[PDB]
Design an enzyme around this catalytic site. Structure first.
Site, mmCIF file in Angstrom:
data_model
loop_
_atom_site.group_PDB
_atom_site.id
_atom_site.type_symbol
_atom_site.label_atom_id
_atom_site.label_comp_id
_atom_site.label_asym_id
_atom_site.label_seq_id
_atom_site.Cartn_x
_atom_site.Cartn_y
_atom_site.Cartn_z
ATOM 1 N N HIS A 1 0.813 -1.205 0.000
ATOM 2 C CA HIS A 1 0.000 0.000 0.000
ATOM 3 C C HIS A 1 0.850 1.259 0.000
ATOM 4 O O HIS A 1 0.842 2.078 0.940
ATOM 5 C CB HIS A 1 -1.000 -0.051 1.128
ATOM 6 C CG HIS A 1 -2.037 -1.128 0.954
ATOM 7 N ND1 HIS A 1 -1.895 -2.363 1.474
ATOM 8 C CD2 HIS A 1 -3.263 -1.122 0.267
ATOM 9 C CE1 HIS A 1 -2.978 -3.110 1.149
ATOM 10 N NE2 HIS A 1 -3.813 -2.347 0.411
ATOM 11 N N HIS B 1 1.493 1.607 -5.713
ATOM 12 C CA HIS B 1 0.109 1.146 -5.772
ATOM 13 C C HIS B 1 -0.791 2.259 -6.254
ATOM 14 O O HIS B 1 -1.552 2.085 -7.200
ATOM 15 C CB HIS B 1 -0.312 0.574 -4.398
ATOM 16 C CG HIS B 1 -1.766 0.142 -4.293
ATOM 17 N ND1 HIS B 1 -2.289 -0.874 -5.014
ATOM 18 C CD2 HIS B 1 -2.805 0.616 -3.466
ATOM 19 C CE1 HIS B 1 -3.592 -1.036 -4.680
ATOM 20 N NE2 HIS B 1 -3.903 -0.127 -3.723
ATOM 21 N N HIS C 1 -6.362 7.241 -2.778
ATOM 22 C CA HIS C 1 -7.241 6.263 -2.125
ATOM 23 C C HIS C 1 -6.641 5.499 -0.968
ATOM 24 O O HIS C 1 -7.372 5.122 -0.066
ATOM 25 C CB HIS C 1 -7.848 5.308 -3.160
ATOM 26 C CG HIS C 1 -7.002 4.092 -3.442
ATOM 27 N ND1 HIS C 1 -5.915 4.131 -4.232
ATOM 28 C CD2 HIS C 1 -7.111 2.771 -2.979
ATOM 29 C CE1 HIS C 1 -5.346 2.901 -4.277
ATOM 30 N NE2 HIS C 1 -6.079 2.069 -3.511
ATOM 31 N N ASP C 2 -5.330 5.236 -0.991
ATOM 32 C CA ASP C 2 -4.662 4.569 0.136
ATOM 33 C C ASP C 2 -3.647 5.467 0.866
ATOM 34 O O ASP C 2 -2.645 4.967 1.386
ATOM 35 C CB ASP C 2 -3.971 3.273 -0.305
ATOM 36 C CG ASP C 2 -4.924 2.098 -0.428
ATOM 37 O OD1 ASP C 2 -5.960 2.034 0.298
ATOM 38 O OD2 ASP C 2 -4.610 1.221 -1.274
ATOM 39 N N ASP D 1 -8.410 -0.931 -8.066
ATOM 40 C CA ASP D 1 -7.668 -1.326 -6.866
ATOM 41 C C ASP D 1 -6.993 -2.710 -6.940
ATOM 42 O O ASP D 1 -5.875 -2.925 -6.412
ATOM 43 C CB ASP D 1 -8.575 -1.260 -5.649
ATOM 44 C CG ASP D 1 -7.831 -0.912 -4.388
ATOM 45 O OD1 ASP D 1 -6.639 -0.549 -4.456
ATOM 46 O OD2 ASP D 1 -8.454 -0.981 -3.310
ATOM 47 N N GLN E 1 -4.679 -17.497 -4.063
ATOM 48 C CA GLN E 1 -4.916 -16.734 -5.285
ATOM 49 C C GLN E 1 -6.133 -17.285 -6.020
ATOM 50 O O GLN E 1 -7.137 -16.585 -6.207
ATOM 51 C CB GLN E 1 -3.699 -16.793 -6.201
ATOM 52 C CG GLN E 1 -2.469 -16.106 -5.643
ATOM 53 C CD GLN E 1 -2.755 -14.686 -5.234
ATOM 54 O OE1 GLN E 1 -2.893 -13.828 -6.072
ATOM 55 N NE2 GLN E 1 -2.850 -14.438 -3.941
HETATM 56 C C1 LIG Z 1 -5.349 -7.576 -4.175
HETATM 57 C C2 LIG Z 1 -5.632 -8.685 -3.211
HETATM 58 C C3 LIG Z 1 -6.403 -8.316 -1.994
HETATM 59 C C4 LIG Z 1 -6.627 -9.343 -1.175
HETATM 60 C C5 LIG Z 1 -7.382 -9.199 0.110
HETATM 61 N N1 LIG Z 1 -6.143 -10.584 -1.516
HETATM 62 N N2 LIG Z 1 -6.281 -11.714 -0.811
HETATM 63 C C6 LIG Z 1 -5.657 -12.622 -1.560
HETATM 64 C C7 LIG Z 1 -5.600 -14.021 -1.109
HETATM 65 C C8 LIG Z 1 -6.895 -14.466 -0.452
HETATM 66 O O1 LIG Z 1 -7.913 -13.782 -0.411
HETATM 67 N N3 LIG Z 1 -6.805 -15.735 0.092
HETATM 68 C C9 LIG Z 1 -5.608 -16.250 0.458
HETATM 69 N N4 LIG Z 1 -4.346 -16.195 0.106
HETATM 70 C C10 LIG Z 1 -3.735 -17.057 0.991
HETATM 71 C C11 LIG Z 1 -2.392 -17.391 1.082
HETATM 72 C C12 LIG Z 1 -2.045 -18.287 2.069
HETATM 73 C C13 LIG Z 1 -2.976 -18.841 2.924
HETATM 74 C C14 LIG Z 1 -4.318 -18.537 2.859
HETATM 75 C C15 LIG Z 1 -4.644 -17.634 1.870
HETATM 76 N N5 LIG Z 1 -5.828 -17.081 1.487
HETATM 77 C C16 LIG Z 1 -7.199 -17.177 1.909
HETATM 78 C C17 LIG Z 1 -7.872 -16.384 0.816
HETATM 79 C C18 LIG Z 1 -8.565 -17.363 -0.099
HETATM 80 N N6 LIG Z 1 -5.112 -12.145 -2.723
HETATM 81 C C19 LIG Z 1 -5.437 -10.867 -2.661
HETATM 82 N N7 LIG Z 1 -5.178 -9.863 -3.530
HETATM 83 MG MG LIG Z 2 -7.524 0.798 0.827
HETATM 84 ZN ZN LIG Z 3 -5.911 0.270 -2.498
#
Ligand SMILES: Cc1cc(C)n2nc(CC(=O)N3c4nc5ccccc5n4C[C@@H]3C)nc2n1
Ligand SMILES: [Mg+2]
Ligand SMILES: [Zn+2]
Length: 324
Positions: A79, A83, A117-118, A228, A280
């Site tokens: 962030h 970004h 935004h951030d 984003d 992912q």
């Molecule tokens: C831009 C952006 C924003 C966000 C919030 N995330 N969150 C993700 C990964 C994600 O949501 N997961 C994820 N990775 C993991 C890696 C390891 C263990 C559990 C994991 N888990 C659980 C869940 C399924 N990639 C994103 N990219």
């Molecule tokens: Mg934000």
């Molecule tokens: Zn952002």
């Protein structure tokens, strides 16, 4: 408590011109700002100028504005300044490809809001600050970071010689600030799910009406979200990289929890690294794909984002099945 740029910085900015070879590539959705760090501020100005014309803002007041924003991004792994620019670019591409769907006032507001935004992110999630028991969540208790981000913008906007919107009418001024506020709050990923479902609905029954302001706000919001998350829309080796960045924060947060003898969710636990590709996959499937799918429907010219998303999805699949 806001930080300002020095005259050296902003005056450097004014004198920057973009290399001709980037003029083409900047217009592409998958364009990666990564290899051009010095140019980032300059690249924003360029985007501003092309979208909104060359004298939309007094160049002087604009350059001071951008460099001050920069200085208020912290040196965290994701962030960050990078970004903000990446996101702002993505919005530029969106706006460009739908040029008449939006107003000068929207386009000014949205590129600015993206860049802002951030602002002053600490690499801590909304959940963290609330769940233990930061002074910020003690001030705004829904969409914590986002309300701060907007307040920050406004503070910077009210700094001496920084007010880029000064020469609007006071009604127009109070409108753009509104646009911005809604745009920034919309980046709280919590709100996106409600928002995409509503859109999904309205589109499907043909009741979505861009003349209705409330609808406008939801379409804008989805854009903000699309912008984003747009790391997922770059070419595989870029995306791959950006992933390590988002994780580094997660695991820095996970670590800070472990220090208070609290088990972080697997996502934030660096001892759960091999689960990454799977994570992912999940994220692409529950968040990204739906986001871009609904955007592509409402805004067909934004299709390339969806396409790039799908390509990255299957790269993650290939990694899981063990072919990378
Ligand atoms: C831009 C952006 C924003 C966000 C919030 N995330 N969150 C993700 C990964 C994600 O949501 N997961 C994820 N990775 C993991 C890696 C390891 C263990 C559990 C994991 N888990 C659980 C869940 C399924 N990639 C994103 N990219
Ligand atoms: Mg934000
Ligand atoms: Zn952002």
């Amino acid at each position: 408590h806001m930080s300002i740029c020095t005259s050296e910085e902003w005056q450097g900015l004014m004198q920057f011109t973009l290399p001709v070879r980037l003029c083409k590539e900047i217009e592409l959705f998958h364009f990666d700002i990564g290899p051009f760090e010095n140019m980032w501020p300059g690249i924003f100005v360029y985007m501003v100028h092309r979208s909104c014309g060359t004298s939309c803002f007094e160049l002087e007041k604009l350059c001071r504005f951008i460099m001050s924003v920069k200085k208020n991004y912290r040196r965290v792994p994701y962030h960050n300044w990078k970004h903000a620019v990446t996101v702002a670019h993505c919005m530029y591409a969106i706006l460009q490809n739908n040029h008449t769907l939006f107003t000068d006032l929207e386009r000014k507001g949205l590129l600015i809001a993206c860049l802002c935004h951030d602002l002053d992110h600490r690499g801590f999630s909304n959940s963290y600050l609330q769940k233990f028991d930061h002074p910020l969540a003690a001030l705004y208790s829904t969409s914590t970071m986002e309300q701060h981000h907007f307040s920050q913008t406004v503070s910077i906007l009210q700094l001496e010689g920084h007010n880029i919107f000064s020469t609007l009418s006071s009604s127009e001024y109070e409108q753009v600030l509104e646009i911005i506020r809604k745009a920034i709050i919309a980046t709280d990923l919590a709100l996106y799910f409600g928002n995409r479902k509503q859109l999904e609905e309205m589109y499907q029954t043909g009741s979505l009406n861009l003349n209705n302001q409330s609808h406008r706000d939801r379409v804008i919001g989805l854009m903000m979200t699309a912008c984003d998350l747009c790391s997922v829309t770059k070419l595989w080796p870029v995306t791959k990289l950006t992933a390590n960045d988002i994780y580094a924060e997660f695991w820095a947060e996970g670590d800070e929890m472990k220090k208070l003898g609290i088990q972080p969710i697997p996502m934030m636990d660096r001892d759960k690294k091999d689960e990454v590709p799977q994570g992912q996959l999940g994220f692409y499937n529950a968040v990204a794909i739906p986001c871009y799918t609904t955007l592509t429907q409402i805004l067909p010219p934004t299709e390339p984002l969806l396409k790039a998303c799908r390509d990255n999805l299957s790269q993650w699949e290939k990694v899981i099945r063990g072919e990378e």
